[PDB]
Amino acid sequence: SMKLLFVCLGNICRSPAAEAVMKKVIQNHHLTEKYICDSAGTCSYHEGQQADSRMRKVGKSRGYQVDSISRPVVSSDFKNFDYIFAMDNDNYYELLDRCPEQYKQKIFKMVDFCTTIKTTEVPDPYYGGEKGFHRVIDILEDACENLIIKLEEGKLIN
Structure with missing residues (x-):
């Protein structure tokens, strides 16, 4: 089972969205046993916070549950x-x-x-x-x- 990590600065807008979208794409391709996703940030400022309320709104509206904790x-x-x-x-x-x-x-x-x-x-x-x-x-x-x-x-593969 291959592991994918998406990274932005604060891990509250972009990479949480990336993580949600990828989980969705993987599930549509019937590949949930082969790939798991996570996201994280280069900065710890926002650690513990939920994803930005705007991104959760727009996310849900676009078909995605953006449910990560920074x-x-x-x-x-x-x-x-x-x-x-x-x-x-x-x-x-x-x-x-x-x-x-x-x-x-x-x-x-x-x-x-x-x-x-x-x-x-x-x-x-x-x-x-x-x-x-x-x-x-x-x-x-x-x-x-x-x-x-x-x-x-x-x-x-490298």
Whole structure:
């Protein structure tokens, strides 16, 4: 059973949505015995908090239960998870900075699985309106669908 970790800064907007969307995609592909998901953040500021009330609202409205409790990436995560997906460039380089050498090859950018939406990142929606939250979901429905295909093709093996 392969383990997938989605990472943003605070683990209250983007990566909780990523986690929900992926769980949904996996279940639709009848793959729940093979892949499990979790999410975490580079920063521990929001540790213990529920997902942002706006993202839960927009999430539910888009067909998703965004039910995570914020938690920070820890050292065991680099060992215990099989693949780790950063929401933006800052998360990406921050994760690489902390990751032991033997494990760096597990780290990917979420947006490098996007096949239709042209974006450099999953943009931080916190300081904007609800349209920004839908945009996050849009990007995650694109990336996540392609990702399950690529995992199942064994393309992520280094």
